[PDB]
């Protein structure tokens, strides 16, 4: 399946989703720290089963599954500063998105 970029990312709390737009790109001029997010990228997870300990454990609390596996870009650690410029490359024919 085709991947895409949106800020609705699984396994994330409020702190990493604090300073993004609607489109998962950091505002021009935010502060950053290694361990956070710049691009919210997600992939179609291929349906693979698991060793059945989690399977009854999924059936205890009602674990909702995801076809949404995180493969986003995160800031390399030890590096801490300011983001000053972005730009977006997009094909011709695909609809130009909001930040485009």
């Amino acid at each position: 399946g085709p991947e895409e970029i949106t800020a609705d990312i699984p396994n994330v709390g409020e702190a990493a989703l604090s300073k993004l737009d609607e489109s998962g790109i950091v505002y021009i001029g935010a502060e950053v720290t290694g361990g956070d997010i710049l691009v919210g990228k997600v992939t179609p997870k291929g349906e693979t089963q698991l060793t059945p300990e989690e399977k009854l454990l999924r059936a205890i609390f009602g674990e909702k599954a995801s076809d949404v596996k995180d493969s986003s870009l995160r800031v390399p650690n030890g590096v801490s500063g300011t983001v000053i410029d972005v730009q977006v490359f997009t094909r011709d024919g695909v609809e130009k998105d909001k930040r485009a």
Partner: protein, 311 residues
């Protein structure tokens, strides 16, 4: 004994920036001792008011441009770091500065309050060459000591701020240059006495006595080590307002327990053996003891107040 007390004698200013002060008289061999000591105090540890936080319209990050000004923005932030202000009573001030018109940007053009004392009126900040562009900044001034380089605060204080609060490194030192010289003090019976010449070179914002005075308050406190030394809210309540397991509040008052101090002594062998409670009740009876840290049957200090409450 042959002690003598040193007295502050003269204060004379060369400029308002440059001042000298003699000290008289020290005792035999004490010249270098108190001189080298006081040099290490005035270099690092005097309080002074420096610029810590700038914030300005039309700015999204630090390294942008701004139309109509000559310098770049971090030359500006390099520039007003050397702007000196004296604060008298307020722990923390906010200035204001608005300007337009073609020409150089002064410091005296800020709308300073009655208690705010700027020092140097000719310290150039910016160069406005187009009258259509304006400058609009707000300058947060604090009072502190040391050389906190503006980054360890934001590594520690993560109260989330919006975009625009530009941080700059503080240079809290009010002192820049200090030396001492050792001359000979004449008192006609003690010709071993030595008087001191202490130089100070700084900006404004300094009383030349206080720097010597507050330094003496530092050594006065840092020598005490060598002379002197060589109620819980739900515990005063009944069972009715405990906010615990669903069927425990209406039933614990049925067995003569209408206090929590009356509850922390009641046994685990016979409270549940009189058929008026449940099996899920003892576990959260235990939570009132375990989460506070008491034992079973522990007699306590004085539980009952003037009000004994039950229905």
């Amino acid at each position: 004994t042959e002690f003598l007390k040193p007295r502050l004698v003269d204060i004379e200013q060369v400029s308002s920036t440059h001042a000298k002060v003699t000290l008289e008289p020290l005792e035999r061999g004490f010249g270098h001792t108190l001189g080298n000591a006081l040099r290490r105090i005035l270099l690092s540890s005097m309080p002074g008011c420096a610029v810590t936080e700038v914030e300005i319209d039309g700015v999204l990050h630090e390294y942008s441009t701004k139309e109509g000004v000559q310098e770049d923005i971090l030359e500006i932030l390099l520039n007003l770091k050397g702007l000196a202000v004296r604060v008298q009573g307020k722990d923390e001030v906010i200035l204001t500065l608005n300007k337009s018109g073609i020409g150089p940007v002064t410091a005296a053009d800020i709308t300073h309050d009655g208690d705010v004392e700027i020092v140097k009126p000719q310290h150039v900040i910016c160069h406005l060459t187009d009258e259509n562009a304006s400058i609009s900044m707000r300058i947060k001034v604090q009072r502190g000591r040391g050389y906190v380089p503006a980054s360890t605060r934001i590594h520690s204080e993560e109260d989330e701020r919006p975009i625009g609060r530009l941080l700059v490194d503080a240079c809290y030192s009010p002192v820049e240059r200090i030396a001492y010289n050792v001359e000979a003090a004449r008192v006609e019976q003690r010709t071993d006495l030595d008087k001191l010449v202490i130089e100070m070179e700084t900006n404004g914002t300094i009383d030349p006595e206080e720097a010597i005075r507050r330094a003496a308050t530092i050594l006065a406190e840092q020598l005490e080590a060598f002379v002197d030394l060589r109620f819980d809210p739900i515990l005063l309540r009944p069972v009715d307002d405990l906010e615990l397991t669903v069927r425990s509040a209406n039933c614990l008052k049925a067995e003569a327990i209408h206090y929590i101090g009356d509850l922390v002594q009641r046994t685990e062998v016979e409270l549940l053996k009189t058929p008026n409670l449940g099996k899920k009740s003892l576990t959260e009876i235990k939570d009132v003891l375990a989460s506070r840290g008491l034992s079973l049957g522990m007699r306590l200090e004085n539980w009952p107040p003037a009000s004994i409450a039950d229905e």
